[PDB]
Amino acid sequence: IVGGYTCGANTVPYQVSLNSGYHFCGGSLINSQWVVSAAHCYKSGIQVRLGEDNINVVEGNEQFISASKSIVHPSYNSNTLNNDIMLIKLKSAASLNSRVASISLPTSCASAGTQCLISGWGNTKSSGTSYPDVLKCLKAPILSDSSCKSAYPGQITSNMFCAGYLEGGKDSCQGDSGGPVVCSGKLQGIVSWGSGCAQKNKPGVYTKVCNYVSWIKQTIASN
């Protein structure tokens, strides 16, 4: 997260870190057994880390649970990042509490102009590299479809939306990938891609979760 703020320990209790020996992506806990992340975050041997604030220090509220299954969207295309969504099943159910909690899936898509909460442990520099210890947060508005397509001509599908600031300086970034965009208390986006981070006229691009609720529900009911 570039240009954001320190969330506060466990104030984003659905935020997970995906660890394969190191933090590499975020994700969102949607019930005690399932995490939503980006398909581009797929790899084998994922351990899901819940209840994290400082990802480098055991502070006492973490739950570390291995992934038992990862399901990449059937139509995921890594070249275009269309359908950049994956489900991760936990080997055992998380214990839900005040610091580890699920985020609701949307019943309707979110609206342009709504301020959403984006969070993660990704790079905090728009040029160069600096990674935070504690979870970072950014409030950013959903941009109009037309402005999103104007920023990324030929690259925005109906399964993507833009959020952020055309002036630059505030954005998600690498390492936030797979993490949540929460609007009005619902998971509406997944950190997906962008040109650089926090660059002028290049806002963040996010997977449009509301298009995937039927697939999520069917998949969870069968796995």
Which is nearest to 32 in space by CA: 107, 106, 92, 72? 92
Closer residue to Ca ion (CB): 6 or 54: 54
Annotation says 133 is catalytic? no
> Does the annotation flag 82 for ligand binding?
no
Q: Is 175 annotated as a binding residue?
A: yes
222 is catalytic: no
Give whichever of 54 and 147 is closer to Ca ion, judged by the CB atom.
54
Q: Could you tell me the smallest distance in angstroms from the CB atom of residue 3 to Ca ion?
A: 24
Binding string, residues 27-66; x marks residues near Ca ion by CB under 5 A: -------------------------x-x----x-------
Host H or E run for residue 214: helix 213-220
For residues 223 and 220, give the distance between their C-alpha atoms in angstroms, rounded to a whole number: 5
145 is catalytic: no
- C-alpha–C-alpha distance, residues 114 and 112, integer Å: 6
Q: How far is the CB of 62 from Ca ion (least distance, A)?
A: 5
| Residue 18, token pair as written in the block | 């995906």
Asked whether the beta carbons of 161 and 208 are under 8 A apart, the reply is: yes
Torsion of CA 79, 114, 150, 1, to 10 degrees: -50
Determine whether the annotation assigns residue 145 to a binding site.
Answer: no
Structure-token match 């965009």, residue found: 181
Catalytic residue among 17, 53, 70, 84: 84
Closest to Ca ion by CB, 10 vs 188, is 10
Work out how close the CB of 215 gets to Ca ion at its nearest, in angstroms, rounded to a whole number.
Answer: 32
Residue 54, marked binder: yes
For residues 92 and 68, is the Cβ–Cβ distance under 8 A?
no
Catalytic residue among 40, 70, 73, 119: 40
Cβ at position 52, least distance to Ca ion in Å: 5
CB of 121 to Ca ion, least distance (A): 10
Sign of CA dihedral 213, 26, 139, 11: positive
CA distance 118 to 12: 10
Q: Rounded to whole angstroms, how far apart are CA atoms 97 and 16? A: 14
- Interface contacts to Ca ion, rule CB under 5 A: 52, 54, 59
Q: Known binding site for substrate: residues?
A: 171-172, 174-175, 177
Q: Known binding site: residues?
A: 52, 54, 57, 62, 171-172, 174-175, 177
Residues that are catalytic: 40, 84, 177
Q: Known binding site for Ca(2+): residues?
A: 52, 54, 57, 62
